[PDB]
Design a protein around this ligand. Structure first.
Ligand SMILES: [Mg+2]
Ligand SMILES: [Mg+2]
Ligand SMILES: [Mg+2]
Lengths: 131, 292, 145, 251, 242
RNA sequence: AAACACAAA
RNA sequence: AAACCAUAGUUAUGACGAUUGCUCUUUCCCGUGCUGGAUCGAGUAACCCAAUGGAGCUUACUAUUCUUGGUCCAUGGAUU
RNA sequence: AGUCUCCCACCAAUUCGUAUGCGGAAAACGUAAUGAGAUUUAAAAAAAUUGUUUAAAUCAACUCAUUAAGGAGGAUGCCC
């Protein structure tokens, strides 16, 4: 009756106050990954650490995270809980989930990286339809 | 619409004087809650029971919404309400609610003992029932008592903003929230964030995710934050502003002049509403025909 | 209303980890070599603390917070190594996985934990324990020949 | 009683399985009660004539409402037949061509002038509306308004569950228990308006024009207007739910 | 009844001869398995794809269940089966299955490269496919090859024993088991116990709860663990005999 | 917990 | 010293998977229509829970937190 | 669910020997026709149950007061 969802996207964005410390430091992709690995291990044990997640279109205080449909609850309970402390910033970090989607239909800017990811995702879509 | 009813004020006793840094931090957190998005914010003030209430009326409210929040609202665009939580554990003879209830808008309670809980559920005229999620629960909460209370009025309040304080408090907070939701039958639940700084605030999605991980469905969270928050604001507002639900001091013409919405127009030093003459006897009764 | 309880029966089994000694292959011989005895340094608060540590170490913070609400050891004696762990019907899987992931006691090593019976009342647990104890005696009597 | 209690316990341990069950839950009563289970004439005249006057006035009001209901319909039908729009021509045409149906029709120009003034003066004296407005007290004013009489009052339906009842102004002719009775005027509309109170919001404005042009903004709630006191005080009130007021915030 | 088909043999190559202590430890492990409650036991033997296969028929299996475990089979009352896994890295020094499929019962494979996954999904007459749960999985498990290998009959094997060894590889094991559960879509998932010491043996309830908390539904666990394992054993027996 | 009482509240 | 007895029977009434049907919304066709048919989606409610059995009465439920039938000298719009 | 009522031995009778609007073993039990009533009343306001807890323009709802079963004759109204 229902189609099996592969995973689910999550719109992540950093919220760091203290404009001076904010413009002083500059986060990157590895920073994001380390923050996630620290949050999962702080809020959960190996259960949270074994959560599958990849990085797509990382920007300045913006990133998109795809999480399995079975672990959306574990991800959304851990993201809104943890607050970074002495990782790379003098001012602790707090993240707020802007929006969520389960159909890939979201467009912020007219860039083409979403188009390329969409192209590879439908070339996998027809491939899982046939296979 | 989103309502947060447990914004704490940096003062517990009347002997304390609030410095400018705390007021600046409160202004910053109000701006933070407004920028991302919110509709109603009611700041909280906490005092204990065995203390000596000052025999004043014009000094019971160290909030002065017209003084500094009057500086902030014209640029912010939201409204603020003053509320008080009563830390009542032993039924002592100190009881002067006839002044603080009429001076403030919302009156809540913080019971620690069983007798205090029983008297606040039966006789004490309050609006919300808040428990000490930091400490241990007083007893094994009953079902019939909470159901009769939420049918009679007062509902329970859950504050997810306290779980962001330390690590050892999260287990007790979850254990208390589970028991409250199990004993309250998920009817009279109002959610709030007790954050003292803008850095411990979250979005509505984080809130609904946390509560759905706690055990309450997300649709019920949305309904309790949309309708039940508005209703618990309305009750505590017109129980003090108006009489016992018989005569209202505010007249809603359109969709913005509401007793809880209209806050700068309605006078507070008195209860009158001086408006120009807009109702005559020669105008046509049918609004579809009445033209000016 | 009713609080939904679910008791858990577990057994402490000691595998005869000794590669230098030859062993007898039979039913009652291995039953006796696996049910030898529990050491003296065995109690209720020493097993509860160990399982509480393992729960936090495997699940995490919230996993221990949701599970430690009604986590108690009702009946346990070190003579037969049989214990009854009370928990919710929601967190039964968590307690079972923690009992499976039990590594060792802080001073006693080389032991495994086997969950046998899970039920929502103590009377059926006692009946099943009596049935298991009666079954154990049969192979013993048969092998004593 | 101690050795007696020991004997009772050694006796209960044979019948019951937990001997200290009843003594703990207090089921062993120490006492067994043995008892079989155990100038009026004119006053009556005035009461009867009052009963009769009430019973007659009820039917009179009902039939008056029905007569107005039929007369409005028939006169509007005849007006649409004759193609006459404004009231100043229609009422004169009815008077010059239909004498009977004219003594059954009401007159708003007859109903407004003294009623409005006699209610405004009464409310001004009740709420102590003075040239200066620094001698007010909101609590006592609201208590008086809850105790005040609204017989012949001007109220406007500003909010209601039905999107069509709002905006109707009228003066009271009688205060019922479920419906509210007023009279409205339009192009040809002279309808007696009956409005439900369960879920509607009313309001009344008191004009004050001594030096400046200002008015007080008061309002009532019909849903909770049914369980109030009448002309007296001291009626124990009950918190109902304060829950079905969602329409007030919704729109 | 339960089926355990991942008991490792203490021998990697052909050159190294087994010792009495290893056989004693294996006997201890099998006795512990039977004590906890099991019905079918299928010991596994690991070998490399580059190691030279002997040109024999009566020497391919350095197990000899009849002379070693045949007495335990009669006394304690269980059965043993032969299983061999193929640690394949590069398509070189191979192209021989008609002689290794008749001697042993169950044939498995262990791909560690992206070409190994293709070679396993395309041109291997295997029944189960296992990964290195201890270390990192080779590149990425996708639905493309997994669906095509499960629709024909090849299942994915999960080693719950590898987690009980150390503390650090637990994270990698969990990250791999959740990945393979998400990719396999929870149809062809068989479970095995890869423990060589009796101190890493568990029961059905604990393993079921672990696999359920890892992402597998309750019906899938029991249905697979029983029926798919029994069917794999039957298919292996049919491949050996006819 | 449920279920019971010329209780008790 | 037992009378021990329930097409649930004494703190139990579990765990997920699959199918039809029910209410609205964005679509195409024959004949207007038809508990006419098929895709894109959302939801399956609440009060609440047995402890020996039956009947009567009263009291809690169904607002995007499933539904159904009728009535209304209730109002709102249109024709005669 | 509820601090409501009743059956779960009999009695040509100090044992509700009760042919009492109908049904019913009983029931603080269901319903039918007419008249009246509102702290000025038979009784609701300044045993149980229920957040609001009958009505008080008309309708609808509650309470109380009368109507014993069957057969025959006459009168009236309807199809005829
Ligand atoms: Mg019951
Ligand atoms: Mg009860
Ligand atoms: Mg009962």
């Amino acid at each position: 009756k229902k189609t099996f969802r592969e995973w689910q996207y999550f719109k992540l964005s950093i919220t760091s106050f203290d404009q001076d410390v904010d413009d002083a430091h500059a986060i990157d992709q590895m920073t994001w990954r380390q923050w996630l690995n620290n949050a999962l291990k702080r809020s959960y044990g190996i259960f949270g650490e074994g959560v599958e997640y990849s990085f797509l279109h990382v920007d300045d205080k913006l990133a998109y995270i795809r999480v399995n449909h079975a672990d959306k609850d574990t991800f959304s309970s851990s993201i809104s809980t943890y607050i970074s402390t002495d990782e790379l910033v003098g001012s602790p970090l707090t993240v707020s989930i802007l929006q969520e989607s389960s159909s890939l239909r979201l467009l912020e800017v007219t860039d083409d990286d979403r188009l390329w990811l969409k192209k590879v995702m439908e070339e996998e879509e027809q491939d899982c339809k046939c296979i | 619409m989103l309502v947060d009813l447990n914004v704490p004020w940096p003062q517990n006793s009347y002997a304390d004087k609030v410095t400018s840094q705390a007021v600046n931090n409160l202004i910053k957190t109000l701006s933070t809650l407004h920028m991302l998005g919110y509709t109603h914010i009611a700041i909280n003030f906490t005092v204990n029971h065995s203390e000596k209430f000052p025999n004043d009326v014009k000094l019971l409210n160290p909030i002065d919404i017209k003084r500094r929040f009057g500086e902030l609202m014209d640029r912010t665009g939201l409204k603020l309400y003053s509320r008080i939580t009563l830390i009542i554990d032993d039924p002592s003879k100190g009881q002067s609610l006839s002044k603080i209830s009429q001076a403030f808008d919302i009156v809540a309670a913080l019971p620690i003992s069983e007798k205090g809980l029983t008297l606040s559920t039966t006789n004490l005229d309050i609006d919300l029932l808040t428990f000490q999620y930091g400490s241990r629960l007083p007893t094994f909460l009953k079902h019939k008592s909470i159901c009769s209370c939420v049918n009679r009025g007062v509902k329970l309040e859950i504050v997810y903003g306290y779980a962001l304080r330390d690590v050892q408090a999260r287990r007790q907070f979850v254990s208390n929230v589970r028991s409250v939701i199990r004993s309250s039958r998920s009817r009279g639940i109002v959610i709030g964030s007790g954050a003292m700084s803008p850095l411990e605030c979250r979005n509505i999605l984080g809130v609904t995710s946390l509560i759905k991980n706690l055990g309450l469905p997300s649709d019920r969270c949305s309904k309790a934050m949309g309708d039940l928050a508005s209703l618990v604001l309305l009750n505590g507002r017109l129980r003090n502003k108006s009489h016992k639900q018989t005569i209202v001091t505010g007249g809603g013409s359109g969709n913005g002049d509401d007793v809880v919405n209209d806050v700068q127009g309605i006078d507070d030093v008195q209860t009158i509403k001086v408006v120009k003459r807009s109702m005559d006897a020669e105008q046509l009764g049918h609004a579809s025909k009445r033209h000016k | 209303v009713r609080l939904k309880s679910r008791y858990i029966l577990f057994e402490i089994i000691f595998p005869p980890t000794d590669t230098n000694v030859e062993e007898s292959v039979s039913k009652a011989d291995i039953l006796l070599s696996h049910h030898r005895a529990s050491p003296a340094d065995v109690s209720i608060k020493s097993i509860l603390q160990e399982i509480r540590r393992s729960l936090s170490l495997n699940l995490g913070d919230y996993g221990s917070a949701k599970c430690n609400s009604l986590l108690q050891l009702k009946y346990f004696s070190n003579k037969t190594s049989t214990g009854i762990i009370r928990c919710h019907r929601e967190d039964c899987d968590l307690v079972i996985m923690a009992l499976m992931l039990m590594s060792k006691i802080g001073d006693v090593d080389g032991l495994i934990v086997n969950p046998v019976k899970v039920s929502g009342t103590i009377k059926k647990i006692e009946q099943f324990a009596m049935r298991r104890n009666s079954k154990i005696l049969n192979i013993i009597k048969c092998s004593q020949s | 009683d101690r050795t007696q209690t020991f004997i009772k316990d050694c006796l209960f341990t044979k019948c019951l399985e937990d001997p200290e069950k009843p003594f703990n839950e207090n089921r062993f009563q120490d006492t067994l009660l043995l008892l079989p289970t155990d100038e009026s004439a004119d006053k009556q005249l005035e009461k009867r004539d009052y009963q009769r006057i009430n019973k007659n006035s009820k039917i009179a009001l009902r039939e008056y409402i029905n007569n107005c209901k039929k007369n409005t319909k028939k006169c509007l039908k005849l007006a649409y037949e004759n193609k006459i729009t404004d009231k100043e021509d229609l009422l004169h045409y009815i008077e010059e061509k239909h004498p009977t149906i004219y003594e059954s029709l009401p007159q708003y120009v007859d109903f407004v002038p003294m009623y409005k003034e006699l209610w405004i003066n009464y409310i001004k004296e009740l709420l102590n509306i003075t040239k200066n407005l620094k001698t007010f007290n909101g609590s006592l004013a609201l208590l008086k308004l809850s105790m005040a009489d609204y017989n012949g009052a001007l109220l406007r339906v500003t909010k209601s569950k039905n999107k069509t009842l709002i905006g109707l102004q009228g003066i009271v002719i009688w205060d019922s228990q479920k419906f509210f009775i007023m009279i409205v005027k339009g192009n040809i509309i002279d309808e007696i308006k009956c409005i439900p109170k369960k879920g509607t919001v009313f309001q009344f404005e008191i004009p004050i024009s001594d030096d400046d042009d200002s008015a007080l903004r008061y309002s009532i709630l019909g849903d909770r207007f049914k369980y109030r006191s009448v002309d007296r005080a001291g009626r124990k009130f009950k918190s109902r739910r304060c829950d079905d007021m969602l329409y007030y915030i919704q729109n």
